[PDB]
């Protein structure tokens, strides 16, 4: 009945997606509030709006508008809300640029939409490789990189620990499905074989995962399973391994990235599962921005009362019919609140739309600060060629400058390809994520750092150890599988996977390290 | 906002180029009567029978939503809009039946695919529509312009017409028609003595500069066009200005259209063209003279059509004059069934039959939409659309002149086209049919009444004197010059002269060498 959003009006407007809510189960469209990957990447675009209103250095003389819509975390979904920015260009506010798409599979859909309308469009968020093709995607650039490296990032840390048997569970879409060929092409490359490539997909319920899990299961030697999977399919996945209590080491991608809500209820079969992410710095005078929200001074998001109710399992007098009234004292702090992963990457996206809009005013209007007539109706295709070229130093929300704190992008309209690996500890009686390496064209890591799921640095290798007094290592066809050849009583193992003759006289140790002389 | 909206269970949109391309700030001209109304009302004909059909959809009526693309691409495109917030007053898009221009037919499919909604063409011929990684929910009931750029090339190589000029029009129709054309071209030994081009709103001047640096090839006599309806239009009335003449070779976006030639009849008189290859559907021709503007109100644009058409005026029309006669009626000696009619009927036809098969598979119990088929699944349906196979709509005589209506792998139709040539014998200026292509060409040469009473020559260079001159082939292989040879020579060859060497001495004919007395 009441489709939700948030309309502010200005001299220009950015259209915003985001997925504020989870996809719904079954017949509903929408599900529970997302936290973190939601409501707190809305609250930064208004943030940075905000702060871009009253930067006189920035677009000073035209106050940015928005329209910001929820995704609830489906392509069609955000598809179709999206209409509402192309019907604007013919009450409807005249959408400028738009800066979103969290999941790859939303951007694409609306980056399939926004070009016939010459909409350009920035995704915070989106790494599917496909996503830099500008034959298709020719409106579409993103702070972020192609999954194209974060899929060697993976590839490069299992072939650091030798983890040549591994299992792969992909996402069906554009996001898991050409991420685990980047990964699959990656690992070929590094003699790695894959024992069973599995995938789920669109509206699974428990059983599909479930099933994926006993797969899993059916290759004991593959211990560490790499993930290339949605946020909410992940969370599904370690729910079900949770059920059958199943345990393996999770090598997953930024869909599940650093998210304790991913593991919640499930921690001790996450323990030590290693994430990527991408590389970003919070943001500090964001945390200052979000803390201060509360429903009292919080009106212009109109998903902000539910998002209250879920953080705090509360209730007012705008709630379902339920119990607990809430204690008008509470409030997100440093004790309940931790800056979402990406939230950089948003700021970012808000500010390189405003940079490209502000420099084409300072060029179609010479004599003021207004928006003239000459940008009264914008050329999209100019727009977004002059949004490519674009280059400053992250929005003032960055320190230092020689970290290369630069926003720009590729001739394909993508970001630099950084990642940071985590390892998901509990130390300190608390589930959490540690930083134990880094990508950036090379791996990186502390390897001393890292806690292994059952204290042990995983083995995952296609067949089982030879035995020590008498077998050898043998490789058949490929570089991955071997079978184990016991010697002769009169034979040593001069190497790993060859036995030798001790000759006459001698004989092999008891070890067969060597041969020792033969007494009589 | 003209439109028309009919409910139904099902819905299938519309789309035709009812209006041409509006001039300078106007989005929308005049009236196009035979490409545009007729085709309208010829969707409108076939959802009436297959509404009256009782062993196609019955129980499930089908209604409409069509609209004008004014020929426009980014009209119909906008226009479209309208096909899919109806999946969200709004009437649910089953599927699209539309797209004459190819530009605005690919702009639409584009859209389309997005909301899985199937679309076919009856009439765009664009081959970049034939990419189905691209237009995964685009089929047509015609063939892709892959094969009418080879018609077009081996009528040239028949005639030995090897330096012809081109001038095609900007966008996906023409530009990808053409670059198919020069490559047919090449193939077959035919070179391009000038390649023009016009784009999007051109005035006349871009035209008559077109003529003019066409008239720079003067050897070049032969001009192959692949021009949209309306660029064909201007360009033959430029060409009408400095009274220029061309034997003119062009494609189905002239077709056998009067309209195009209408006051510029002397200047295209001669020209070959191309159409699909079709049969006109008679039980049409019987509801389109029926209709007049008292009987036909759902068809929002047939006033104006009315008015256009008999130079007329009401009481519906802007401050003119010379009301009109309310005995006026379309029939035999103003109408003639526009040629691509066929198309659209089958293509609507297809739709439905489409619908019907998914009716009675999800359907099985009732002869109604069901609930399993209340939310369409629209990928479903384009598989269970291509795999169709019907013979055409009743409409259609016999069954062994392959009658049928089906797809291709990539969702085309057969490439079929006719040749015609614009005479004028009787006085009064026609289009005959002078040929055909399958696979091969195909035509009786002596029907043609060419440009100037005599079959055209369109090559490089002057063909060589007789008595004494040999071809010489300097850098391509189109043009050359001719050398005489000396008295002594004879012409061993076209292109090569040789000493008859001593006591003898070339023949009359220079094909020998014969002694010499004394
Ligand atoms: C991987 O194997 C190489 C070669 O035997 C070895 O040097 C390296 O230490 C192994 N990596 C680890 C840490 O398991
Ligand atoms: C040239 O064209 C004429 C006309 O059809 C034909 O009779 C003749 O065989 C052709 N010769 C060539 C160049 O092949
Ligand atoms: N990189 C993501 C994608 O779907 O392309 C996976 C997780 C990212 C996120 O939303 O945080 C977006
Ligand atoms: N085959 C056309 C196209 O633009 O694709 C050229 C003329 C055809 C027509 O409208 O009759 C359509």
């Known amino acids: 009945f009441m489709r ?131 034959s298709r995607y ?41 991420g685990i060929e980047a990964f699959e092409q990656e690992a070929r490359l590094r003699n790695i074989c894959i024992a069973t490539a599995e995938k789920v997909g669109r509206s699974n319920i428990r059983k599909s995962y479930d099933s994926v899990i006993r797969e899993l299961l059916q290759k004991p030697n593959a211990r560490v399973v790499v993930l290339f999977m949605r946020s909410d399919d992940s969370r599904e996945l370690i729910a079900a391994a949770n059920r059958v209590n199943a345990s393996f080491t999770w090598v997953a991608s930024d869909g599940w990235g650093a998210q304790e809500s991913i593991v919640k209820g499930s921690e001790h079969v996450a323990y030590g599962a290693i994430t990527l992410e991408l590389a970003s710095h919070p943001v500090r005078q964001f945390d200052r921005y979000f803390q201060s929200l509360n429903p009292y001074n ?57 940079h490209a809009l502000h420099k084409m005013q300072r060029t179609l209007c010479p004599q003021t600060t207004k928006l003239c007539d000459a940008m009264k109706i914008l050329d999209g295709k100019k727009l977004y060629k002059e949004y490519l070229l674009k280059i400053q130093f992250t929005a003032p929300f960055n320190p230092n400058k020689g970290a290369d704190s630069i926003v720009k992008f590729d001739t394909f309209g993508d970001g630099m390809g950084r990642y940071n690996v985590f390892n998901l500890q509990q130390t300190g009686g608390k589930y959490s994520y540690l930083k134990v390496g880094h990508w950036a064209e090379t791996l990186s890591l502390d390897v001393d750092s890292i806690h292994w799921s059952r204290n042990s640095v995983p083995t995952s290798q296609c067949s089982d150890p030879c035995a020590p007094n008498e077998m050898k290592n043998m490789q058949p066809g490929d570089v991955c599988c071997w079978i184990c050849i016991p010697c002769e009583p009169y034979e040593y193992l001069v190497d790993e996977f060859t036995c030798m003759d001790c000759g006459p006289g001698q004989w092999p140790t008891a070890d067969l390290s060597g041969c020792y002389n033969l007494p009589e």
């Open 4 to 134: 939700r959003e948030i309309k502010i009006e200005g001299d220009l407007v950015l259209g915003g997606l985001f997925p504020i809510n989870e996809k719904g189960t079954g017949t509903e469209e929408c599900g529970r509030i997302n936290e973190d990957r939601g409501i707190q990447r809305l609250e930064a675009m208004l943030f940075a709006i905000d702060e871009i209103n009253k930067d006189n250095y920035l677009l000073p003389g035209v106050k940015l508008g928005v329209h910001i819509l929820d995704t609830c975390s489906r392509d069609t979904y955000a598809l179709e809300q999206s209409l509402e920015f192309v019907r604007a260009s013919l009450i409807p506010l005249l959408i400028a640029g738009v800066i979103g798409g969290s999941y790859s599979s939303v951007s694409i859909q609306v980056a399939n939409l926004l070009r016939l309308f010459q909409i350009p469009q920035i995704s915070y968020a989106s790494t599917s490789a496909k996503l830099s093709d500008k």
């Open 138 to 178: 020719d409106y579409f650039a993103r702070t972020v990189p192609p999954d194209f490296y974060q899929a060697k990032a993976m590839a490069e840390i299992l072939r650091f620990f030798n983890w040549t048997y591994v299992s792969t569970v992909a996402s069906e879409g554009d996001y898991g499905e050409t």
């Open 298 to 354: 919080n009106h212009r998001n109109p998903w902000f009362r539910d998002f209250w109710e879920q953080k705090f399992q509360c209730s007012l007098q705008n709630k379902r019919n339920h119990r607990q009234v809430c204690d008008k004292h509470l409030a997100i702090d440093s004790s309940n609140y931790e800056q979402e992963s990406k939230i950089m990457f948003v700021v970012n996206a808000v500010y390189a739309m405003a």
